[PDB]
Design a protein around this ligand. Structure first.
Ligand code: NI
Ligand code: NI
Lengths: 569, 238, 79
């Protein structure tokens, strides 16, 4: 029995229970809630340290011996913020807890046994979160995938065939042959992938064929015609096949207004993209659907957080993508009904209130694929600066707000697209898609990505250097990124129907192929920490937003965190 | 003889009861098995004699064993002895309820309860609705039935009951005799509020938009107390 | 008067209607096979005089303004 000062203990093994750590350069403070360690029995790797034959590596290991163990990791998950060791076996998370050798240490369970087959990854002073999930990908260029990978995203869900004009507008992979093209192209990449089909048709047979061809759901986009008939048919087929539907509603109100669209949805599960409406949607009041029980409301990162440069940038961006002219009054009228700084301001507060549940990209289609996580944490920091600490906090920390915002890109999109049994959280039994963060760089620049239980990307110095640290340091592909190893580390998500028909063997796919499930029986109440339903009213004239009778707004930010301190460009 | 499996089982039971009666004659205090078997064998023999009705045997099964004839703890373990016996008019089930009275202190499986009450449906506000059964048949409604879709013969302000259930103990029920009028408490249905079945009046997400469709469907199908405004506007999916 | 018709404007252009705005537009007949599927599920079949009555009745039931379909509507075997 010896006494150790908290300072040297934290320097050796990381923060322990009751300690607090700042996240990046923000004002969000994370407090360690619990510790799974036995004081005096910590796992350390190095010369003369504990992780050695006969001390912490067992000479008589259990049969569930780990392949990889992450020691002294601070886990930031929606299930809690705590210190533990993470054990990885066969691409899954095998255990969370103490970890070590049962011959020489007390509290070691068989699923956390370190033996001669175990690799050691030091996590002391580091944060472990689940890999991010981006559910609004326009597959416009393959170069988006490495960019999203380097920011902490491990699953991309969306649609497209490339730089075609249909893809530049829509997240749609249309038809069986184009699905086959994209599924065989997917074998290249270090990313979990799933593809959305075209929902914009009234032909049930055409809808069903795309699902059986491997799509995990439908996208309904106004550029292919978002009409109530197509919405109704697509929802009927999706209910028969248990796949998700995403919608980009009619901004022009051509076939009807927002209530007509809700009537076409008819109380069935729907995932709405850019619900605030700058990215498209019933002008000016698409944002009202974010209070409905059957809606899963997502936002795209270009509108968060609301800043002084946001409105002019979005205006000029809209004038370019739609080829509008400033000398035409009708184009100006369209643009003014579309941007609405009022709804953009309201969107940040709705994220703080838990009304919006998912953050996404809309990549290279008015959105930045490498900035979903960064803009989510910028929004959290701005909201804490404006509204102060949340009232659901328990202690001098921001743990509740941290969980609320972390769920927006990890667990809620996974639940929304029926993959939350595989990815989305640091839980035992799930796929080992993990991101290592140093707290000083949290939310902007990760340390390394573990994909399928193996290291796939990391910061790395020059190959000729005597150690891995010296400059230049940038993100480089690791061994799970190469050869036949990438087939074991990566998943292609398909529908249950396609999986049952042997889509993997028919198309000769070497990646893991998994079916999505539980997409039709979820509501807004199934989103973690973002399950607030409310009556949202939008003023047709002033465009003001009222939630439960009270006006909701935020003020723009002239400076954000996690932006110019961390990037050269 | 052409004995059936039932006859072999009943013969075994008769001789178990015979052993119990012999031990009782010797002065041994009977245990659980012996008491059960003695009651069952007595009922079977009485039914064979054919001089008593089944109800008489149900009453007579309770006088065979005094509390002093059994071991401590036996009386509290025998809630009911059921036995099927063949009377002159065929096979009837005779059940004896609480045949033996408790006299000791031993209670196997005794429950020691806290005296605090349980608060069910906490956080749910209850409204009160007056309901009358204008039909000629009894109606009974369980705790988790969607009260909007109860028997069309019940008359009440259906609009106020949409998306609600009875604020009573789970698995209990409220009865409505023909012509009976009483008020009940209704709480909101929890979870995802996805109402499927019950009369096919909703079969979708419960909300204000679907309440209009439900009210219109209820009025078209003659559910009492339904007042959905005329000039109804249909939606694309009904 | 607008059944089976579309705007007689340049392909891919549009006409805007501001709240409260009133203006006149030109409509031409839809070409090809005149098989109208989708758009509100008001027709979802061949466009002709027989289906115009069904469309008018459906439009009136669903509250589309300016729809005057005669009362005492006679249903067909497939509606
Ligand atoms: Ni969109
Ligand atoms: Ni998009």
């Amino acid at each position: 029995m010896k006494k150790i000062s908290r300072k040297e203990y934290v320097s050796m093994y990381g923060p322990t229970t009751g300690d607090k750590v700042r996240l990046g350069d923000t004002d969000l403070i994370a407090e360690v809630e619990h510790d799974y360690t036995i004081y005096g029995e910590e796992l350390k790797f190095g010369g003369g340290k504990t992780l050695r034959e006969g001390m912490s590596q067992s000479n008589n290991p259990s049969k569930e011996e780990l392949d990889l163990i992450i020691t002294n990791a601070l886990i930031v998950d929606y299930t809690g913020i705590y210190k533990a060791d993470i054990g990885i076996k066969d691409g899954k998370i095998a255990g969370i807890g103490k970890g070590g050798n049962k011959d020489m240490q007390d509290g070691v369970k068989n699923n956390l046994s370190v033996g001669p087959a175990t690799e050691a990854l030091a996590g002391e002073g580091l944060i472990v979160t689940a890999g991010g999930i981006d559910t609004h990908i326009h597959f416009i260029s393959p170069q988006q995938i490495p960019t999203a990978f380097a920011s902490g995203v491990t699953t991309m869900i969306g649609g497209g065939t490339g730089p075609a004009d249909g893809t530049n507008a829509t997240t749609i992979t249309p038809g069986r042959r184009n699905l086959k093209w994209m599924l065989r192209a997917a074998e290249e990449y270090s990313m979990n992938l799933g593809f959305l089909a075209k929902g914009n048709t009234s032909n049930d047979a055409s809808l069903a064929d795309q699902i059986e061809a491997g799509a995990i759901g439908f996208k309904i986009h106004e550029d292919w015609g978002t009409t109530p008939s197509a919405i109704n048919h697509a929802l009927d087929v999706a209910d028969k096949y248990d796949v998700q539907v995403a919608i980009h509603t009619d901004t022009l109100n051509e076939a009807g207004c927002v209530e007509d669209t809700m009537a076409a949805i008819a109380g069935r599960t729907m995932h709405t993209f850019h619900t605030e409406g700058a990215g498209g949607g019933h002008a000016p009041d698409i944002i009202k659907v974010a209070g409905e029980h059957n809606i899963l409301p997502a936002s795209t990162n270009p509108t968060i957080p609301f800043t002084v440069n946001t409105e002019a940038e979005h205006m000029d961006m809209l004038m370019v993508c739609h080829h509008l002219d400033k000398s035409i009054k009708e184009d100006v009228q369209f643009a003014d009904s579309r941007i609405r700084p009022q709804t953009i301001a309201a969107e940040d507060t709705l994220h703080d209130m838990g009304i919006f549940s998912i953050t996404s990209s809309d990549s290279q289609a008015m959105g930045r694929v490498g900035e979903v996580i960064t803009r989510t944490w910028q929004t959290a920091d701005k909201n804490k600066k404006e509204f102060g600490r949340l009232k659901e906090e328990k202690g001098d920390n921001d743990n509740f707000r941290i969980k609320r915002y972390l769920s927006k890109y990890t667990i809620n999109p996974a639940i929304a697209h029926g993959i939350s049994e595989y990815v989305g959280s640091v839980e035992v039994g799930k796929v080992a898609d993990l991101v290592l963060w140093s707290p000083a760089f949290f939310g902007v620049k990760p340390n390394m990505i573990i994909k399928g239980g193996f290291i796939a990307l990391s910061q790395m110095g020059d190959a000729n250097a005597s150690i891995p640290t010296p400059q230049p340091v940038y993100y480089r592909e690791m061994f799970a990124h190469h050869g036949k190893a990438k087939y074991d580390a990566n998943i292609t998500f398909v529908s249950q129907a396609a999986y049952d028909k042997g889509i993997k063997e028919e198309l000769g796919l070497e990646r893991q192929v998994l079916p999505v499930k539980n997409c039709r029986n979820i509501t807004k109440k199934d989103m973690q920490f973002n399950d607030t339903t409310a009556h949202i009213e939008v003023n047709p004239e002033t465009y003001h937003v009222f939630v439960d009778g009270k006006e909701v707004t935020s003020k723009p930010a002239n400076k954000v965190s996690l932006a110019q301190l961390f990037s050269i460009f | 003889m052409k004995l059936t499996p039932k006859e072999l089982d009943k013969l075994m039971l008769h001789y178990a009861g015979e052993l119990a009666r012999k031990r009782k004659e010797k002065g041994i205090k009977l245990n659980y098995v012996e008491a059960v078997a003695l009651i069952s064998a007595h009922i079977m023999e009485e039914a064979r004699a054919g001089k008593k009705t089944a109800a008489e045997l149900m009453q007579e099964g309770r006088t065979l064993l005094k509390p002093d004839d059994v071991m401590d703890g036996v009386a509290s373990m025998i809630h009911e002895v059921g036995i099927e016996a063949m009377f002159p008019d065929g096979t009837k089930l005779v059940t004896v309820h609480t045949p033996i009275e408790a006299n000791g202190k031993l209670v196997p499986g005794e429950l020691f309860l806290k005296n605090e009450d349980i608060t069910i449906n906490e956080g749910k506000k209850a409204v009160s609705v007056k309901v009358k059964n204008v039909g000629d048949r009894p109606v009974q409604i369980g705790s988790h039935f969607h009260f909007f879709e109860v028997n069309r013969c019940l008359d009440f302000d259906r609009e106020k009951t949409f998306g609600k259930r009875l604020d009573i103990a789970s698995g209990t029920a409220v009865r409505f005799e023909p012509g009976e009028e009483k008020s009940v408490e209704l709480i909101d249905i929890g979870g995802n509020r996805r109402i499927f079945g019950f009369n096919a009046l909703v079969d979708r997400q419960a909300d204000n938009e679907s309440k209009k469709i439900a009210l219109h469907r209820a009025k078209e199908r003659g559910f009492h107390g339904t007042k959905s405004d005329d000039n109804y506007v249909k939606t694309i999916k009904e």
